[PDB]
Amino acid sequence: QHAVILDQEKYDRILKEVPTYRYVSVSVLVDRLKIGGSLARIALRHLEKEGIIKPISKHSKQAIYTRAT
Amino acid sequence: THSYRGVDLEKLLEMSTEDFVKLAPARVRRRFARGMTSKPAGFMKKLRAAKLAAPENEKPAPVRTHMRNMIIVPEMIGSVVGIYNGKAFNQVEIRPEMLGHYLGEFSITYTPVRHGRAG
Amino acid sequence: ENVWFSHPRRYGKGSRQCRVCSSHTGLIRKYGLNICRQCFREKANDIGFNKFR
Amino acid sequence: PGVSVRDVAAQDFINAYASFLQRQGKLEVPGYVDIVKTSSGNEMPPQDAEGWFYKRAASVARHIYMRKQVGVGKLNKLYGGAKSRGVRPYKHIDASGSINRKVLQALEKIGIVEISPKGGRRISENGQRDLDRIAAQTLEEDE
Amino acid sequence: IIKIRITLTSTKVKQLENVSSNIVKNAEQHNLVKKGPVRLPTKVLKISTRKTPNGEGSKTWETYEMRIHKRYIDLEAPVQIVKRITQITIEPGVDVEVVVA
Amino acid sequence: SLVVQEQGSFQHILRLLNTNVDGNIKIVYALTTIKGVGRRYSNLVCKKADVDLHKRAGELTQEELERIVQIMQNPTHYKIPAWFLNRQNDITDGKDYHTLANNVESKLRDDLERLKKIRAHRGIRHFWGLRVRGQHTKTTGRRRA
RNA sequence: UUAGACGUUCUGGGCCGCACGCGCGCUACACUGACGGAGCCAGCGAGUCUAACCUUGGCCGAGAGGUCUUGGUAAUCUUGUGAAACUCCGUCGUGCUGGGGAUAGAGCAUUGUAAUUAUUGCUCUUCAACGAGGAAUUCCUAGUAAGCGCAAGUCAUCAGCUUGCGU
């Protein structure tokens, strides 16, 4: 079903597809990509410490992110 | 081969009823911690006195009683007891693995169902 | 005959009873009243329990 | 111009103070810190298994700061919640008392609360001095 | 002189307030410091029986109430005038207790 | 930013105590498919075996799994207190055992057969296939199955 | 009917017994969620003198609970009843799964003269049906419906019930 471990063929799919995502979120990752949900909640952290997406609101039950540029 | 909680069966009989409770479960430990004036001597005198009737042959005379709420102790091993179910005394020989149980566990108080099928 | 009344009555419905009719059913023991439901309803007015709202 | 812990957000103070207690490393966490459920209404142990005890010690010290004095019976009612007893409805259940008593004894040994007249435990001379210093740093975190 | 306290308890408003009024009226007939009547919150004692004997009918419920009004007055007086004022104002339905200190 | 790129050491379904453990769920709840461990026993044995709880089961190289199954089969030697234990002063030994994967259905069978051959009231209810605890039967418990 | 009692009292048992049909309900079928930390907010009330009631605080214990004391005959003490839903942060990630907790095993306690046909509480283990319920059918118009707990009655012990109360 949904992948829970990065396999370096999903990793480059992260970097070259989330800039095309104008709305990006936990449920956005698991629908268009096939990712484990808890991997998405780690990915949205990783996509913030180096800016590829930017936060507009961070609630514990809902994260909302847009492309940085 | 039979042991209760690590002590052998030949260690059970050569052991007082106080030392048996010290390794019993919590219900048995609680009852005889507050078991003063429980009147235990009237029944237990008739059990040892019935073991002298049979020298070496088959099981002793039954000792019928109403006390369904009495915990089986190792001094009762080998005796036979008629336990009042409410209308009738049922003889049950006290097997060694009956320790810590109530006498009412071995005399049912109802004839179960037999739903239909008159036959 | 030393077994005549020997069963303990120290708690539960067998010990307490109504002080007007000596029943065990429907007892009211709020504020130490000890009167049955039906007896209390006939003399709540004398005790001082009126019915306002 | 001078701040108390009442000018700091509760969650942001307790997290910041819990980290400070662990960095000092002198609290004498009990050996049973990783076995216990912390209430009989709970189902599972605390998830942050390394530093859940420092968060109770930080939460309790702020609570004693804001109140006059409390004892281990008031903390059990505070930290307890509803219990799922399956097919029967929920009800309030008090928390574990051994944990709160060990927290209070640890705080007395570090010397941040003290035994009080009228019972319970009040916050101490060093308690106000030390709670307010981390209270000062938490305001000035924003660069 | 001595510090005294008079506590009044009744189930009747009209029979209690005039008794406390007589207490204070005798208190400034010969003047002394009042600490006048501090009315405690009224207590409503509720008994909720069902309605009936036997449970036939709609499940209708009654509630009966007894209302307890309580008042205490904290006076100080010489020892002589204590007994007379505690004995003159005696009225049915009103329970008066006097605490010595 | 906890992204890790391990690719080769991951493993699918794997056997522990003769049970297929799912390899791609978190280890504490992956162990709970073993009959005899639960969400709170497995948590404590992972803590005692010193496993990072955030790992999937496809992690946990074989010496860590060997440590884990050492803890499960012998808890009291690794400071687990005797009140987690599934059997305490059990029925014959007086020792403290935590019953595990295949022994759970057998020790239960041992206990039922032990109190069936004595003709205790619990045993007769078990043999008849009725509710052995003191609970009503007139309206519930239908569809014996 | 009234002495071999239909009076009364005592030991046991039953009222709870299960092929099955019905009525009131409780918990659910999960992400508007479960779990773990953190925040922290009521109102109605009840409570012991020749009797052991409500119990703060210290100590012990994983917990249930134990123990040493204390306050209160009460707008004074329990009690600000620091209630629960709720709120914040994190773990889970659409999988009858970390939803659900029926059924069952082993132990530790508490009330009671007495707990077996589990009184009840707790600890570990066991992990059932249930994926939003056919014909039918109930209640309800604003601080109402619904969600959420709390006190009291019954009580020695037992609340999935009721009478109220607030959120």
UniProtKB/Swiss-Prot annotation, chain D:
The gene is RPS19A. GO terms for cellular component: cytosol; cytosolic small ribosomal subunit. InterPro entries: Ribosomal_eS19, Ribosomal_eS19_CS, WH-like_DNA-bd_sf, WH_DNA-bd_sf. PANTHER family: 40S RIBOSOMAL PROTEIN S19. One of its GO terms (molecular function) is structural constituent of ribosome. Changing residue 56 to E/Q: Loss of mature 18S rRNA, protein doesn't bind 20S pre-RNA complex. Lethal in double RPS19A/RPS19B mutant. The keyword Cytoplasm applies. It comes from Saccharomyces cerevisiae (strain ATCC 204508 / S288c). GO terms for biological process: ribosomal small subunit assembly; ribosomal small subunit biogenesis; ribosomal subunit export from nucleus; translation. This is Small ribosomal subunit protein eS19A. Gene3D superfamilies: Winged helix-like DNA-binding domain superfamily/Winged helix DNA-binding domain.
Swiss-Prot record, chain F:
The gene is RPS18A. There is a cross-link at residues 35, 48, 79, 95 (Glycyl lysine isopeptide (Lys-Gly) (interchain with G-Cter in ubiquitin)). N-terminally acetylated by acetyltransferase NatA. The keyword Ubl conjugation applies. Pfam families: Ribosomal_S13. This is Small ribosomal subunit protein uS13A. Component of the small ribosomal subunit (SSU). Mature yeast ribosomes consist of a small (40S) and a large (60S) subunit. The 40S small subunit contains 1 molecule of ribosomal RNA (18S rRNA) and 33 different proteins (encoded by 57 genes). The large 60S subunit contains 3 rRNA molecules (25S, 5.8S and 5S rRNA) and 46 different proteins (encoded by 81 genes). The modification N-acetylserine is found at residue 1.
